Amino acid sequence: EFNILLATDSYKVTHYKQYPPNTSKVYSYFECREKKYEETVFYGLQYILNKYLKGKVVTKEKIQEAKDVYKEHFQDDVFNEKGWNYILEKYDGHLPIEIKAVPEGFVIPRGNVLFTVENTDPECYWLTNWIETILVQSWYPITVATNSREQKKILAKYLLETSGNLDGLEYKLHDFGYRGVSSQETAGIGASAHLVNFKGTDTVAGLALIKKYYGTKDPVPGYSVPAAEHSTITAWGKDHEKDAFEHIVTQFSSVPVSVVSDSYDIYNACEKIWGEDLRHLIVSRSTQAPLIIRPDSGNPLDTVLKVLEILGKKFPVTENSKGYKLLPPYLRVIQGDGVDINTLQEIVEGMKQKMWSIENIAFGSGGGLLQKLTRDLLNCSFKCSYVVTNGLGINVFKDPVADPNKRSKKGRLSLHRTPAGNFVTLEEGKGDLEEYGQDLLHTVFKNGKVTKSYSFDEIRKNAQLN
Amino acid sequence: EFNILLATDSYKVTHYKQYPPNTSKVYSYFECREKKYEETVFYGLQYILNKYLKGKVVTKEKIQEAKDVYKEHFQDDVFNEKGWNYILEKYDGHLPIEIKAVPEGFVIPRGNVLFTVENTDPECYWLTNWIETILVQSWYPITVATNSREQKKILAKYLLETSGNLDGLEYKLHDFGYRGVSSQETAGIGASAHLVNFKGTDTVAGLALIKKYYGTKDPVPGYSVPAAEHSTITAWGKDHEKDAFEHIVTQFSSVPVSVVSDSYDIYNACEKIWGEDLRHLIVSRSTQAPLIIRPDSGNPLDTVLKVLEILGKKFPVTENSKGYKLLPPYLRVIQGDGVDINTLQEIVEGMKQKMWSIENIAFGSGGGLLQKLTRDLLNCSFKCSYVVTNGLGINVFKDPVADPNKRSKKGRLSLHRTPAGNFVTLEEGKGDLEEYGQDLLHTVFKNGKVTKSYSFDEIRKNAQLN
Ligand SMILES: Cc1ccc2nc(-c3ccc(CNC(=O)c4cccnc4)cc3)oc2c1
Ligand SMILES: Cc1ccc2nc(-c3ccc(CNC(=O)c4cccnc4)cc3)oc2c1
């Protein structure tokens, strides 16, 4: 069972003894610090609030479990048993904490406050930064959603230029990353962040998370299609790849079906098997049930161009209104190997230079989409900016001499949209002057209750592209 | 609640209709494919077996939940309800699967079979690769433990060369990565893998995982020390950094204490505050309660060298038997910023060139230790190598023409220890002759039961260095 008393950096156990005496308030904030990724999608905090922070999170058994662990962990008795018992007795195990945050799905430029945390009881000054570790992990859904959205910008640009519209954009980047992430929980978190921007996923864990913690009026927030893996091809034997292809496309004759075609020779498979031997089974397929050919090895751009060239010689290629080549509607391609934001850019530019419409292709991304990301990509950071000690408020900050990029903000913070539509974070409590509009940070958590929730539809709407 | 019917890649739902008709057996294996990191630590499978695969994992309610999700997910009725109902009725929801694996903690060279999976009921041919996604996630504990062990090799070599012994080696790489990983579950898994090689961690989640799933004869597998963060320094105000330092080292006068010293000026803190104003509180400390100075910004190597040079002018430095400089025993340093396996090598090499002993220092690693890792680092992969169709066993494999590095093995596999202590993987069932000895793969899971378990002490012994 999860125990919030055991869900922090070990050294934070010792911090209640280190603050200035008579500290009654510790006020801290989260930002994606300025160091491309000029704007970030704020997403994932609601999951953390509901799963870990709300309700009765302190019990007498959890206090004793933490006391016994930390006794051995530090070889010393430093655990603040009295502080946690105070929360258990006065608030029935509810955290005396207030959290204000920008609405989820909001797209905020780097270097702005995204949420703030402060204690609501003077006895619990130490609690604000106790939960830093749990809250900082929101870097991951933020970073997945942001990196996924940046790839949507690339796809939208090249889809618009080669087709004149954005039809099918929401299905052009498919989540392949279930096996390539570090845990089941990460898979669900990361997949849901990708679904902020797209509707195609094979990481089923993301569906249950959205349903339980955000909710959507759609039947499911993400969709997939029947498809083969190498095992369902290679199980037929090396000499019977054609029989495997024939069986699978016949089993799935009325729906879209993706067949991985590089088990032995992707180019042979496209030219001879799909393009000749089984060509009669492909050209008869409906527009809503195309064959999707999946290469999965080699240089991603060179393979895509070589596959398109081969398919263009065996199947009738037309030209769309913008003048770019378009496979017949019963034939599409997905490149699901070696795809990250960098190679995605190279492939669509390479296809455009060869006058291929992006309508022909979608992309599958696994580790590049959900795992090859770190907290340093957006510099997601949690810092104390304001304290009250013996009734005196003090604006606090760090400013390391050897790294000015690590300087943190001072005092009580607020986020505002200027009349020109820019964003500004006001420091030192200057938001009290009301020079701008209302503070964009709203109370989402207070004293054990989630006070403001967003549906997955609202988040998707807030995160739309221009 | 976890539902194994929803814990797979979406497209695997459709694979039972894609295998050759009358397929009764699908046999698959896991390896860290060939083409640094020449040997891998096998760790983490036992966690997956107990938490996700053992016991009654199929219920009628879970079948209905999966049926509803996949109906909307595919906009189609493709879910294999009949196959999962059979397992519920025939085996009381226990998976008819056998898994054989190398003992956890074993250090195996790349390109060897690590575990195999096969169905034990011919009706459940499809189940072997259904659970590929869950099992492939063992890449993460394998990769964390392997990458952590390689850093232990680097530290051991330079600690031995600069000091003549290995004292304190198991505390030279401390886990700082709780906030920098993608989820709570990842934190526990990754922290436990690091503790295979070291005993210093602040990611508390690793302790509970080891206690629940592996066990150790000591009360806890990992330890930490009291330490400050920037907030317990900066909360005193910029003009009172000295007062914060004094308060913290006095609170923790009899135990080791780490004080982050770069909030405003690391060089001022070492030269003026630690080196003059508070020097009398440091030189009086015990050898078992040193002050640990923590820089946290700037170039990691240059900052360490500049901090050590400053301390050498204010504190008595000796030269050890090997000829390297050594701080007094009441004063140590931890570099916990910008550390991964690459910068760790550069720092200890840089310290050696300046004649500084590794005895002086430990390293904290966060994202670099637990998050900046992907499945392609060791090429952890799961592939079907053997099937039975119409009573005929067929050795199957993939072999993409454009990437021979992705070729997979053929037939039934076994792992053997050579007389010289090497490892060899025999393919095509050729392991039955036992020319070098018994198969090192042992059944760890069969028909819903974990049949072989290892303690964390056994794993640590298996994963030790030469
Ligand atoms: C033009 C166009 C538009 C939209 C498309 N959607 C797909 C598509 C969706 C789903 C899958 C099945 N999943 C996998 O192959 C897989 C592989 C590795 C790990 N996990 C899953 C295949 C293809 O292709 C499209 C093409
Ligand atoms: C020579 C020597 C040997 C062994 C040592 N162990 C430490 C040491 C252990 C633990 C902590 C406290 N944790 C953190 O500072 C922290 C920072 C970020 C995220 N999470 C935690 C400090 C220092 O210093 C050593 C020095």
Residue numbers in the entry:
A (entry chain A), B (entry chain B): 8 to 42, 53 to 483
Task: List passages from the publication reporting this PDB structure.
Nicotinamide phosphoribosyltransferase (NAMPT) is the rate-limiting enzyme of the NAD+ salvage pathway, having an SL relationship with nicotinic acid phosphoribosyltransferase (NAPRT), the key enzyme in the NAD+ Preiss-Handler pathway. NAMPT exists as a homodimer in solution 29, 30. Monomeric NAMPT has a modular structure consisting of two domains. Two monomers are arranged to form a dimer in a head-to-tail manner, where the first domain of one monomer is assembled with the second domain of the other monomer to form the active site, indicating the presence of two active sites in the dimer.
To determine whether A4276 inhibits NAMPT through direct binding, and to elucidate its mechanism of action, we solved the crystal structure of the NAMPT-A4276 complex which showed clear electron densities for A4276. The asymmetric unit of the crystal structure contains two dimers of the complex, with dimer-1 composed of molecules A and B, and dimer-2 composed of molecules C and D. The crystal structures of dimer-1 and dimer-2 were superimposed with a root-mean-square deviation of 0.204 Å for all equivalent Cα atoms. A4276 nestles in the U-shaped central β-sheet of the second domain, adopting a V-shaped conformation with a kink at the C10 atom. The structure of A4276 comprises three parts: nicotinamide, benzene, and 6-methylbenzoxazole groups. The active site of NAMPT can be divided into subsites-I, -II, and -III, which accommodate nicotinamide, benzene, and 6-methylbenzoxazole, respectively. Through extensive π-π stacking interactions, the pyridine ring of nicotinamide is trapped between Tyr18 and Phe193 of subsite-I, where the substrate nicotinamide ring binds. The amide group of A4276 makes polar interactions with Asp219 and a water molecule in subsite-I; the -NH group is hydrogen-bonded to the side-chain carboxylate of Asp219, and the carbonyl oxygen is connected to a water molecule interacting with Ser275 and Ala245. The benzene ring of A4276 is nestled in the hydrophobic subsite-II lined by His191, Val242, Ile351, and the Cβ atom of Ser275. In contrast, only one side of 6-methylbenzoxazole interacts with Ala379, Ile309, and the hydrophobic part of the side chain of Arg349 in subsite-III, while the other side is exposed to the solvent. Overall, the crystal structure revealed that A4276 binds to the active site of NAMPT exclusively through non-covalent interactions.
